[PDB]
Amino acid sequence: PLESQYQVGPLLGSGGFGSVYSGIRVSDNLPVAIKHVEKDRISDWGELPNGTRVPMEVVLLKKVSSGFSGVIRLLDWFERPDSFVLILERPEPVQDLFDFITERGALQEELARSFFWQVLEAVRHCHNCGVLHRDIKDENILIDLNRGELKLIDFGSGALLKDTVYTDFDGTRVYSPPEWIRYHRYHGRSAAVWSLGILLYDMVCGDIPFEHDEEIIRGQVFFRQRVSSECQHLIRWCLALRPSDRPTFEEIQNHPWMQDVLLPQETAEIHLH
């Protein structure tokens, strides 16, 4: 069963997402993460191509599953009487972006550009697979320290991507857009761009731009750190109050600040050495 196949290690973290343990797949010693999600805390349920009733998180993970290293890979899953157990990949050595920024402070723009570009490629992969993450933030990004490769994780607040309005949200409030705060309505892509603006500001300033609902609604962006004019322009564009004024993923990737990105290996050599 699950217990024989995996050697359970220390608790890595717990919160809204459930409880996550470090682990090792007994067969080939592969490092894994073991995520426990309780059934009574699962609001969104879905169906696999075979028809089994599983949490939406499992449906979304299977849709994004591929060799592309920018998004976490679900290795296996198990149903228990009161919970679901997810076996996910675990890079080693690794650090999440929240811990990285906490430890190092505001990131050099060259590093932020490499990290932000990789997040953009990971989000485009989710969207191409028909998945909306809905919780893009530093805590949901892993840094593979040896490779300089980032991984988007935690599809627990996600949904199938649609072109109609979303009226439900259970991601991070401080990353949520002003249309959600004011109207309890948002469209997938433009809400994702807002959260990307919050994330980019967080990378280059070392903290998020808004704390309160009033601040999000006003959308006045103040730079507390020295940030280049092109980077400030890109951030302010992603953080446009009107969702239709926000750039598309293509416009973000074609922005002058996004040019000449380092390769992940060059990023590891210069900044993660």
Ligand SMILES: CC(C)Oc1cccc(/C=C2\SC(=O)NC2=O)c1N1CCC[C@@H](N)C1
């Ligand atoms: C030890 C490294 C830094 O952390 C991890 C490595 C591999 C997986 C996970 C977690 C995953 S994967 C997924 O889809 N959902 C998850 O909850 C993980 N987390 C531990 C709890 C805190 C979190 N921010 C990072």
